[PDB]
């Protein structure tokens, strides 16, 4: 049983973010995106992210 | 014979002022 369903994000919760940086795969580097929508807990009552 | 497609360019016809109302965070 999960500990505190009101403060937890479980595996398989899809986040939707917008890709801020243009991605070119020729050289290894890092990327950056911003969440577009608040993401709630598994119980769905608290905005964590 | 092919290049990286450019991202969508917005049209420049429908021009409107952005601020219909004074924003409240201006204390207005």
């Amino acid at each position: 049983r999960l500990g505190n369903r009101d403060m937890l994000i479980t595996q398989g919760t899809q986040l939707d973010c917008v890709l801020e940086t243009r991605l070119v795969t020729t050289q290894p580097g890092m990327t950056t995106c911003h969440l577009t929508r608040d993401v709630y807990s598994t119980s769905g009552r608290v905005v964590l992210l | 014979c092919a290049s990286a497609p450019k991202p969508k360019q917005p049209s420049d016809f429908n021009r409107e002022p952005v601020n219909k109302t004074v924003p409240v965070e201006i204390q207005r």
Binding site: L19 | P7, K8, F13, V18, N19
Partner: protein, 246 residues
Amino acid sequence: LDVPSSSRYDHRIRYVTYNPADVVQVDTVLGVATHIMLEEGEQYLTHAFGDSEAYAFARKGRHIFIKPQAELANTNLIVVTDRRSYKFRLQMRNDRNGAMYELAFRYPDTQARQTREANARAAVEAAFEQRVGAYYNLKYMMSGDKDIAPVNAWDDGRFTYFKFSANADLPSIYFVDAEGNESLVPRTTVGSSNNIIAVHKVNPKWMIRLGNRALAIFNEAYDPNGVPNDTGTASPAVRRVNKGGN
């Protein structure tokens, strides 16, 4: 020679006001364990007795235990820590009365320091939020995919704020040059409900994208002059000084 103040429930527990210029008198009776509690975060260096065999010493961290184990013990203690050094004048009590079980220190110096720096953030936060003597420009046009439009846009001469409705998906902003080349601009998010995105530049153009949708923003009154950041802080009221020295 401060005599520690008796606890109201029992005189056997005594509080005393610390001072780097006075020595506290310690009254010890035969066969009781004297408890010294140091304030949190004191790093103990070493101590010294007047007679190492007179009093029994045990310490772990901020707790010091003192106990007389030899008759007629009239000596003194000098304990040193990273911050300060406590001084005591030990008198052996001859009648096994007026015993003091534990001593606790009150530090007016730490209170004075922390209260002052608490007021320091008080002034800093007040200066940040007050933001008076700042002007706002609202002349902004728009064109493109209207569905992702920001409900309001304005600039304070230093930043540019975009806001969106609570149901609006937060888009990305790209800073546009004169030639039409897009480039990154650092964005910070403020506002009551994360409905304000602020970009760290004022530019006669901006562009907003999301998915395969776009939008352009025009600053109809781009003022290249602006106000110099005379203090290196978002406010004109927060001086920024070089702590590191060296």
